[PDB]
Swiss-Prot record:
Start and end residues of each stretch annotated as Interaction with NR3C1: 1-208
Functional summary from the UniProt entry: Molecular chaperone that promotes the maturation, structural maintenance and proper regulation of specific target proteins involved for instance in cell cycle control and signal transduction. Undergoes a functional cycle that is linked to its ATPase activity which is essential for its chaperone activity. This cycle probably induces conformational changes in the client proteins, thereby causing their activation. Interacts dynamically with various co-chaperones that modulate its substrate recognition, ATPase cycle and chaperone function.
Localization (cell): Nucleus; Cytoplasm; Melanosome; Cell membrane
Protein name in the entry: Heat shock protein HSP 90-alpha
Subunit structure: Homodimer. Identified in NR3C1/GCR steroid receptor-chaperone complexes formed at least by NR3C1, HSP90AA1 and a variety of proteins containing TPR repeats such as FKBP4, FKBP5, PPID, PPP5C or STIP1. Forms a complex containing HSP90AA1, TSC1 and TSC2; TSC1 is required to recruit TCS2 to the complex. The closed form interacts (via the middle domain and TPR repeat-binding motif) with co-chaperone TSC1 (via C-terminus). Interacts with TOM34. Interacts with TERT; the interaction, together with PTGES3, is required for correct assembly and stabilization of the TERT holoenzyme complex. (Microbial infection) Interacts with herpes simplex virus 1 protein US11; this interaction inhibits TBK1-induced interferon production.
Portion of the full sequence shown: 16 to 223 of 732
Family: Belongs to the heat shock protein 90 family.
Location of N6-acetyllysine modifications: 43, 69
Residues binding ATP: 36, 78, 97, 123
Domain notes from UniProt: The TPR repeat-binding motif mediates interaction with TPR repeat-containing proteins like the co-chaperone STUB1.
Amino acid sequence: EVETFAFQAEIAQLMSLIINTFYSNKEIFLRELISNSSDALDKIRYESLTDPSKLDSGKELHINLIPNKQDRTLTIVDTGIGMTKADLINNLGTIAKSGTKAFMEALQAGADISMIGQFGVGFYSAYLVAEKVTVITKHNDDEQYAWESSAGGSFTVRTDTGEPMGRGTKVILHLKEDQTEYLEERRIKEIVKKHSQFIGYPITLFVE
Ligand SMILES: CCCCn1c(Cc2ccc(OC)cc2)nc2c(N)ncnc21
C-alpha cells in the first residue's frame, strides 16, 4: 500500500521557489546531497563507537554516485545512518520548517540559492535538476522504505520491496530532460572536485 501525504506548507513553498526561480548555477545540488550523505556517515560512525552492533548491517562507510542514461537517473548512494518512517513522513519536515523560513528571508538581504545548505534544507535543491526524486532508505531500527515526490505539494511513502540495502540511503534523481549533463562522467568529476573534494569518505563515481 502506498500512502500519500501533503508536505507541510513551508516546504511546498520552498520546493516551488526552487523549481520556479531563475537560477543558472544548478550544479550545487550535488554537493548538498553529498554533504547530507557525509553527515549521515558521521552519525552512524559516531554511534558505533559505543555500540559496535550498529555496524552489523554493514561496516563499509562510503558514497557512490551512479549515472544511468537509460533510466535518466543519477543516484547518490550512502551507507550512512539511514532514515526511519517517521523521519520521512514527519520529523525531517518538522525540522525543515525553521530553516525554510530563514532561507526564504535571506533570499532578500540578497542571498542566493547556492547558500541553501547554510539553512539545513539542502536536500530540496535536488529539485533544481530533477522532475522526480525517489529516496530509498534503511535505518537500523526500521524497515526499508521508498519516499517519492514530483513536488506539487505531495509525496508518497511505501515499504520498499526492492533489493534490500543493509543500511543507508539512495537518493535517485529522475533528471529533467534538459539536465542530462549530470549523467556525464566529466561533468560529475568536475563538480565533485570543485565542491566536495575533502569529504572524509571514499566517493566512487561509477561509469556507464
Ligand atoms: C536533515 C538531515 C538529515 C536527513 N537526511 C538527508 C536530508 C533529507 C531531508 C528530507 C528528506 O525528505 C525525504 C530527505 C533527506 N539526507 C540524508 C541521508 N543521505 N542520510 C540520513 N539522513 C539524511
